[PDB]
Amino acid sequence: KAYRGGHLTIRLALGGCTNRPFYRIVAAHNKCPRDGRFVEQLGSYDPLPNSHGEKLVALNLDRIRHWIGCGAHLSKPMEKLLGLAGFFPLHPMMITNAERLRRKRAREVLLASQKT
Amino acid sequence: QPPPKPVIVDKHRPVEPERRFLSPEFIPRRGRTDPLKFQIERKDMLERRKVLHIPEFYVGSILRVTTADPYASGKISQFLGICIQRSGRGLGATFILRNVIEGQGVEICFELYNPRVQEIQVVKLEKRLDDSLLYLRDALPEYSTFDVNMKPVVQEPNQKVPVNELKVKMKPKPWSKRWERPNFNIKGIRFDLCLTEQQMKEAQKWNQPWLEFDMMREYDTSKIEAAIWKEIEASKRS
Amino acid sequence: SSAYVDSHKWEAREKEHYCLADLASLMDKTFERKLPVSSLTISRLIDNISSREEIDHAEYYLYKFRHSPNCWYLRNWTIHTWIRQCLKYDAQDKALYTLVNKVQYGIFPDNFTFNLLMDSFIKKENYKDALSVVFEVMMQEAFEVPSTQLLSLYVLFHCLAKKTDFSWEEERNFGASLLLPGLKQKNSVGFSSQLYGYALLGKVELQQGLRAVYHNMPLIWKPGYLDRALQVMEKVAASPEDIKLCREALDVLGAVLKALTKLVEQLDIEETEQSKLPQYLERFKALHSKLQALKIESEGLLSLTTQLVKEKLSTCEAEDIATYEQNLQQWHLDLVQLIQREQQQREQA
Amino acid sequence: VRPRLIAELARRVRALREQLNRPRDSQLYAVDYETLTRPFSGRRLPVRAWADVRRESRLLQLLGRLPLFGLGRLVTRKSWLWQHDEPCYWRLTRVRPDYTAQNLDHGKAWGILTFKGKTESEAREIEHVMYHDWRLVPKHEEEAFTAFTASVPYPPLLRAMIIAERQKNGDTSTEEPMLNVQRIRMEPWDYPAKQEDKGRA
Ligand SMILES: [Mg+2]
Numbered sequence: 093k094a095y096r097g098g099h100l101t102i103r104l105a106l107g108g109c110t111n112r113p114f115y116r117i118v119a120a121h122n123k124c125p126r127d128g129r130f131v132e133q134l135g136s137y138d139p140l141p142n143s144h145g146e147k148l149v150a151l152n153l154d155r156i157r158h159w160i161g162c163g164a165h166l167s168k169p170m171e172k173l174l175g176l177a178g179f180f181p182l183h184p185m186m187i188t189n190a191e192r193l194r195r196k197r198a199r200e201v202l203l204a205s206q207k208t
Numbered sequence: 209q210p211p212p213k214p215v216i217v218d219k220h221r222p223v224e225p226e227r228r229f230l231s232p233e234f235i236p237r238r239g240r241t242d243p244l245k246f247q248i249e250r251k252d253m254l255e256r257r258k259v260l261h262i263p264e265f266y267v268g269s270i271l272r273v274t275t276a277d278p279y280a281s282g283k284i285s286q287f288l289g290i291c292i293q294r295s296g297r298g299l300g301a302t303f304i305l306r307n308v309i310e311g312q313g314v315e316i317c318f319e320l321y322n323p324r325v326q327e328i329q330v331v332k333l334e335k336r337l338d339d340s341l342l343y344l345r346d347a348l349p350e351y352s353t354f355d356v357n358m359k360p361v362v363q364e365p366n367q368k369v370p371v372n373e374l375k376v377k378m379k380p381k382p383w384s385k386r387w388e389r390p391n392f393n394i395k396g397i398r399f400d401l402c403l404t405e406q407q408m409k410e411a412q413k414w415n416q417p418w419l420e421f422d423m424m425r426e427y428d429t430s431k432i433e434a435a436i437w438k439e440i441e442a443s444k445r446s
Numbered sequence: 447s448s449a450y451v452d453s454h455k456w457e458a459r460e461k462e463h464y465c466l467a468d469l470a471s472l473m474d475k476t477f478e479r480k481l482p483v484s485s486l487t488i489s490r491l492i493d494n495i496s497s498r499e500e501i502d503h504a505e506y507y508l509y510k511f512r513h514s515p516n517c518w519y520l521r522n523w524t525i526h527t528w529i530r531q532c533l534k535y536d537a538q539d540k541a542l543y544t545l546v547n548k549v550q551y552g553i554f555p556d557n558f559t560f561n562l563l564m565d566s567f568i569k570k571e572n573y574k575d576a577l578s579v580v581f582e583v584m585m586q587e588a589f590e591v592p593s594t595q596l597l598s599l600y601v602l603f604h605c606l607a608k609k610t611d612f613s614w615e616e617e618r619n620f621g622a623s624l625l626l627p628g629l630k631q632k633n634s635v636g637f638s639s640q641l642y643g644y645a646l647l648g649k650v651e652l653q654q655g656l657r658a659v660y661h662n663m664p665l666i667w668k669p670g671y672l673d674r675a676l677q678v679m680e681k682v683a684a685s686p687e688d689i690k691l692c693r694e695a696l697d698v699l700g701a702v703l704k705a706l707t708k709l710v711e712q713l714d715i716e717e718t719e720q721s722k723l724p725q726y727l728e729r730f731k732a733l734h735s736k737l738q739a740l741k742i743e744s745e746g747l748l749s750l751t752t753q754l755v756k757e758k759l760s761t762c763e764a765e766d767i768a769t770y771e772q773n774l775q776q777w778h779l780d781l782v783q784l785i786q787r788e789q790q791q792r793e794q795a
Numbered sequence: 796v797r798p799r800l801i802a803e804l805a806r807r808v809r810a811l812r813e814q815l816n817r818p819r820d821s822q823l824y825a826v827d828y829e830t831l832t833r834p835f836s837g838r839r840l841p842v843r844a845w846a847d848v849r850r851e852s853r854l855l856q857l858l859g860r861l862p863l864f865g866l867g868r869l870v871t872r873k874s875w876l877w878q879h880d881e882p883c884y885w886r887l888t889r890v891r892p893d894y895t896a897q898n899l900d901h902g903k904a905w906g907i908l909t910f911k912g913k914t915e916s917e918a919r920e921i922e923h924v925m926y927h928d929w930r931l932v933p934k935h936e937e938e939a940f941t942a943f944t945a946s947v948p949y950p951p952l953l954r955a956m957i958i959a960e961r962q963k964n965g966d967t968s969t970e971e972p973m974l975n976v977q978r979i980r981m982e983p984w985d986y987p988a989k990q991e992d993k994g995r996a
Pocket residue numbers: 384
C-alpha cells in the first residue's frame with residue numbers, strides 16, 4: 093500500500109484479549125491502521141502489574157535513535173512513556189496532571205478536616 | 209447603496225434612422241372583394257392592437273409566448289420557438305413556432321389576435337434568406353434545438369434587420385417535400401452535401417424561368433399599403 | 447488667485463479627438479469579453495469628452511474599470527483629466543458623489559489638483575461640499591502639501607461657523623481632521639489645533655468608547671488623548687510664542703461635563719478612563735493655572751490668523767505651480783512611450 | 796496491457812474546468828454577519844473570531860480607502876500586537892485586488908515583514924489575509940511606533956549512557972556533557988507561513 097505523502101510514526105499497537113491490553117511501541121506510517129502492518133517491532137509494554145507488583149516495558153535505544161535520525165514523529169502516549177522513562181524529556185501535560193491531582197487531594201484533605 | 213445604472217448611447221447618422229415597416233397580414237390577397245371587408249377587419253385588429261403590442265418580427269426569429277390555457281398548471285402556457293412562417297390574412301393570420309425538446313420536435317400554430325394569448329416576446333430578431341423555413345423538419349435537430357430559458361437578446365431600438373446568411377445540413381434523403389426543386393427557390397440548404405451533381409442536373413429540368421419574367425401575375429401594392437398606412441395613423445390619432 | 451486656479455496648458459495640451467461613440471463601443475465590448483484594458487482608452491475618452499452625458503458615460507466606464515481585472519495602476523494624470531472634465535462642465539454633485547464613494551470609483555487627486563478643486567469651491571462659495579471633501583481628505587491622509595494651508599483655513603473657519611452642538615459622526619470627523627494639517631509644526635495655530643483635536647478625540651472616546659476612534663478612522667489606539675493634550679500643554683509651557691484662543695474654554699467645558707456624573711478592550715491592571723477622569727481634571731486645572739502663570743490674550747480669532755498665512759501661502763503656491771509643471775513634463779515624457787506601445791501591437795498584427 | 800483514455804480525458808477536463816471557473820476569492824471569503832457562516836461552505840466560524848468578524852473589517856476593505864492601497868503604509872498584525880508588546884508590521888510591496896468584488900475588498904498582497912523588530916531581507920506571501928483582524932496605523936506616530944532596540948543538560952539516562960560510553964573508551968572526561976541551545980531558534984506560534992504551501996478549495 094503506497095500511501096501518498098504521509099510520514100513514519102512510532103506508535104502503540106494493541107494486543108491481547110479484552111480486559112488484557114498489551115501495548116507495543118513500533119514504527120509505521122501515519123496512515124496505517126491501529127493493528128496494521130509495521131516495519132520493525134521496537135518494544136513492548138504491559139499496563140498490568142506482574143507478581144512482583146511492577147509492570148513490564150522494553151526499549152530499543154540504538155534502533156529508536158536510528159529511526160528518529162531517519163525521521164519519524166511520535167505519538168503522545170509513547171513520548172509520554174519515554175519522558176517518564178528518562179531517555180526523553182518529561183511531559184508538560186504530565187506535570188499539569190500531577191499538579192492538578194495534588195491540588196485536588198489538598199482540597200479533599202481540607203474538606204475532610206472541615207467535616208471532622 | 210444605490211445600484212449602478214448602465215446606459216448605452218449609439219449615435220450614427222446613416223445607421224440610426226430606419227423609416228418604415230408594415231405587417232404582412234394588413235395587406236390583402238390578390239383575390240377580389242370589397243375593401244370594406246378589409247378596412248373593418250383592419251380597424252378591429254387595430255383597436256385590439258391598441259391593447260396588444262405584437263413586437264414586430266420576421267421568419268427565423270425566436271418568439272416566447274404566454275397564453276391563457278383553460279385547464280393547465282396555473283391556467284397558463286408558456287412556449288418558446290423559432291418562427292417557421294406567418295400564414296393567412298386578416299384576423300385568421302397566424303404564425304408557426306417550433307422547438308426541439310427532450311429529443312422531440314414540437315410545433316404550434318399561434319393565432320396572434322385571439323384573446324386566449326396574453327403576451328408575445330421577441331428573444332431575438334433576425335431574418336433568414338428563405339422566407340419559409342419548413343425544411344427545418346428534415347434538418348438536423350441541433351439547428352432547431354433552442355433554449356426555453358434564454359432571456360431576450362437586447363436589440364437596438366432603431367436599426368436595420370440582422371440577416372444571418374448561413375447554410376444548414378440536413379437529414380438524409382427520405383424527405384417529405386422534395387426541397388430540391390426550383391419551384392421553392394430556397395438556398396439555406398447545402399446541395400453539395402445533401403445530394404449529387406447528378407441530382408442537381410436531374411432537378412434543373414423543373415426549372416421554369418418564365419415565372420419571374422411574367423408580369424401579369426405579380427400584385428402591385430404601393431398605393432394600397434400607403435392607404436393602409438394612412439388608415440393606421442388615423443386610427444392611432446383618433 | 448485666478449492664475450493659480452486656471453491653466454490653459456491642460457486644456458490646450460495633447461488632445462486626442464477620437465469618436466466618443468467608437469471609444470464607448472470599444473470599451474463596452476472589451477469589458478463584455480472581460481479582458482484587461484489599458485488606461486490609454488479611458489484617457490483618450492476623457493480627453494475627447496465635451497458633454498455632460500459623455501462625462502456620465504465616463505463615470506460608468508470608470509466604475510467598470512474599477513471592477514475590471516486591473517485596478518491598481520491609478521494614473522494621476524488620467525484622474526486629473528477626469529477632474530477637469532467634470533469641474534469645467536460644472537457637475538459638483540457628481541464630483542462630490544464620486545469623492546465620497548471613492549471606494550466605488552477610486553479618485554485620488556494630488557496636492558495641486560485638489561487645491562484647484564477647493565479654490566473653485568471657494569469661488570462658488572459653498573461650505574458643506576468643502577467640509578465633506580476635507581473629511582474625505584482626512585480619510586486620504588494627504589496633508590504634507592501646499593494644500594495644508596487651505597485645509598487649515600477650511601477647518602478653522604467651518605468649526606467656528608458650524609454651530610451644531612451634538613453630532614457624533616461629525617464631531618469625530620472634526621476631531622480627527624484637525625490633527626493632520628497641524629503636523630507641520632509651524633506655530634501656535636498648528637500645535638494648539640493639534641491640542642484641540644486631541645481634546646475632541648478624547649471627548650469622542652469618553653462619550654462613545656475607543657472603538658469608533660480607530661475602526662473606520664485611521665487613528666492610534668492609545669486611550670490617553672486627554673493625557674496627550676496635557677503633555678502638549680506642559681511642554682509648550684516649558685518651551686517661542688503661543689497665540690491662544692478661547693477653545694481652551696471649550697476644552698474646559700468638555701472636561702467638566704465629562705467629570706459630571708460587553709467587550710472589554712481596556713487592560714485590567716491599567717485603570718479605566720472612567721476612573722482617570724478625576725485626576726485628568728485635577729492635572730488639567732493645574733496646567734491651566736500654570737499656563738496663566740506663564741500668550742494668554744485669547745482674543746485673536748483663529749480664522750482671522752489664517753489671513754496671515756495667505757502671504758506665505760502666496761509664496762508656496764509658486765513651489766506648488768513648479769511641482770505641477772514638473773508633473774506635466776514627466777507625464778508628457780513617459781506617456782508617449784505608451785502610444786508607441788500600442789503601435790507595437792498594431793505593427794505586430 | 797490494456798490502456799485507458801477516458802480517465803485521462805476526465806482528469807484533463809476536470810482540471811481545466813476547475814482552474815477556469817473556480818469560485819472567486821471574494822465569493823468564498825464573503826461572510827454574513829448575523830449568522831456567521833460563509834456562503835458556498837455552510838461552515839460556522841470559531842468562537843474566538845466570532846466577535847472580530849462581527850466588529851472588525853478586512854485588509855482590502857481597509858486598503859480601499861486610500862490611493863494605490865497604501866504602498867508602504869502601515870498595516871499591523873492585530874494578533875501579533877495583542878500577543879506581544881513589541882511592534883510587528885508588514886512591508887507590503889505588491890497588491891492585487893479581485894475585480895469581481897463589489898467593494899474591491901478582497902485580493903492578494905504581500906512584501907517584507909518583521910517580527911519583534913527582526914526584519915528580514917525577504918518579501919514573501921502573507922498569511923491569513925481574509926481575517927477580520929486588520930488594523931491600519933496612520934503616517935503620524937510612525938517613527939515612535941517603529942522604534943525598537945547557553946546550554947542544557949542531557950536527560951539523566953542519556954548522560955549516564957554517554958558516561959558509560961566514554962568510560963568504556965577509557966578517557967575520564969569529568970566535564971558534564973551539554974548541547975547548544977542558542978543555536979536552536981525555538982520559534983513562536985505566530986511566525987507566519989507560506990500561503991502557497993496551503994491549498995485552496
Ligand atoms: Mg409526407
